[PDB]
Design an enzyme around this catalytic site. Structure first.
Site, PDB file in Angstrom:
ATOM      1  NE  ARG A  55      -3.952   2.483   3.047  1.00 30.78           N
ATOM      2  CZ  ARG A  55      -4.045   3.140   3.625  1.00 30.78           C
ATOM      3  NH1 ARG A  55      -3.040   2.656   4.351  1.00 30.78           N
ATOM      4  NH2 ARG A  55      -4.642   3.558   4.051  1.00 30.78           N
ATOM      5  CG  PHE A  60      -0.865   8.719   3.520  1.00 27.18           C
ATOM      6  CD1 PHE A  60      -0.700  10.052   4.723  1.00 27.18           C
ATOM      7  CD2 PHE A  60      -1.607   7.355   3.040  1.00 27.18           C
ATOM      8  CE1 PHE A  60      -1.100   9.348   5.902  1.00 27.18           C
ATOM      9  CE2 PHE A  60      -2.384   7.926   4.869  1.00 27.18           C
ATOM     10  CZ  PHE A  60      -2.028   8.122   5.721  1.00 27.18           C
ATOM     11  CG  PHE A 113       2.613   4.690   8.073  1.00 23.37           C
ATOM     12  CD1 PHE A 113       2.530   4.314   9.492  1.00 23.37           C
ATOM     13  CD2 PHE A 113       3.008   6.169   8.078  1.00 23.37           C
ATOM     14  CE1 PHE A 113       1.693   4.602  10.343  1.00 23.37           C
ATOM     15  CE2 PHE A 113       2.781   6.740   8.912  1.00 23.37           C
ATOM     16  CZ  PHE A 113       1.827   6.065  10.017  1.00 23.37           C
ATOM     17  CG  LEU A 122      -1.149   9.988  10.436  1.00 22.50           C
ATOM     18  CD1 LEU A 122      -0.751   8.881   9.872  1.00 22.50           C
ATOM     19  CD2 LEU A 122      -2.730   9.032  10.798  1.00 22.50           C
ATOM     20  CG  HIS A 126      -0.865   5.143  13.143  1.00 22.00           C
ATOM     21  ND1 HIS A 126      -1.060   3.712  12.865  1.00 22.00           N
ATOM     22  CD2 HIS A 126      -1.559   5.954  12.933  1.00 22.00           C
ATOM     23  CE1 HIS A 126      -2.017   3.989  12.173  1.00 22.00           C
ATOM     24  NE2 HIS A 126      -2.956   5.154  12.173  1.00 22.00           N
TER      25      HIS A 126
END
Lengths: 165, 145
Positions: A55, A60, A113, A122, A126
């Site tokens: 992904r 981003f 990520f 975020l 996260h």
């Protein structure tokens, strides 16, 4: 030194792209840094090596770490399964930030990520546990194979990885 | 419901108070009998999870049955989660999450998010899914009474 450094050798459809290295803030998030480090060296018998970035969303982040199911719905830690959000002391302050890709509070496995931008919303959701030391240009190269929903146009893999020095 | 406003775009129209009152009346007079089901469906067309919860919470005085319906919904919500594993990741701007059962039920989802799931090509019809869970709970309490 307290904080360990790890590397990824990224490949695009088998062809070498380049190396990204990370500093892991074990001084702030030891349990989360340790999980990522051990999965990069492969000392448990399983880990990131050979796994893909499934992904990637331009502007981003780049997401990988799912070495079991390969699709976002898998992965596992060095603690057996899913472990807690250690803390949210560190913030998503810009590109290069390495953070845990969970599926909710306290669902940390192996997926992570790398931010290609400042992702302030975020914070508190996260866990930030590292940052790109070298090879941000490789990450920028990776995100060129991304798309609006994350579906990569080319197979982006971690051809090799380990701990440095 | 989600209707075309005076400017043509898809918007959250609240639920009509008279339609709510009509529902309250049906349950007040008929109670939870087989007839209350076709009525609920008819009065909840296009309803969001929030609208469906407004219809349920306006039922002022049927405690045991409402607890029975709630449990049935919670079971269906738990079944949804079990049948719908979540893809890990951060959510980008522009898009949203995969709805969990608690989201379809409107307990962990804003009206804004429910509208988002509903107004999607192709959509997550959270209103129609939740309504089905409510209709199953109704059938259960409709056979109890």
């Amino acid at each position: 030194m307290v904080n360990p450094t790890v590397f990824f050798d990224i490949a695009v459809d088998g062809e070498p792209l380049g190396r990204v290295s990370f500093e892991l803030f074990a001084d702030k998030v030891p349990k989360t840094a340790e999980n990522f480090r051990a999965l990069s060296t492969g000392e448990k018998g399983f880990g990131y090596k050979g796994s893909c970035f499934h992904r990637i969303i331009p502007g981003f982040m780049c997401q990988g770490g799912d070495f079991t199911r390969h699709n976002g719905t898998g992965g596992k830690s060095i603690y057996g399964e899913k472990f807690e959000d250690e803390n949210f002391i560190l913030k998503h302050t810009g590109p290069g930030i390495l953070s845990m890709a969970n599926a909710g509070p306290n669902t940390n496995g192996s997926q992570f990520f790398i931010c290609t931008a400042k992702t302030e919303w975020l914070d508190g959701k996260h866990v930030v546990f590292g940052k790109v030391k070298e090879g941000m240009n490789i990450v920028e190269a990776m995100e060129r194979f991304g798309s609006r929903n994350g579906k990569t146009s080319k197979k982006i893999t971690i051809a090799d990885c380990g701990q440095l020095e | 419901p989600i209707v075309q406003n005076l400017q043509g775009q898809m918007v959250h129209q609240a639920i009509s108070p008279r339609t709510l009152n009509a529902w309250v009346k049906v349950v007040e007079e008929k109670a939870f009998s087989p007839e209350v089901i076709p009525m609920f469906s008819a009065l909840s067309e296009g309803a969001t999870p929030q609208d469906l919860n407004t219809m349920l919470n306006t039922v002022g005085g049927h405690q045991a049955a409402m607890q029975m319906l709630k449990e049935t919904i919670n079971e269906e919500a738990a079944e949804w989660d079990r049948l719908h594993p979540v893809h890990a990741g951060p959510i980008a701007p522009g898009q949203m999450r995969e709805p969990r059962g608690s989201d379809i039920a409107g307990t962990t989802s804003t009206l804004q998010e429910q509208i988002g799931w509903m107004t999607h090509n192709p959509p997550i019809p959270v209103g129609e899914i939740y309504k089905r869970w409510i209709i199953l709970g109704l059938n259960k309490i409709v056979r109890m009474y």
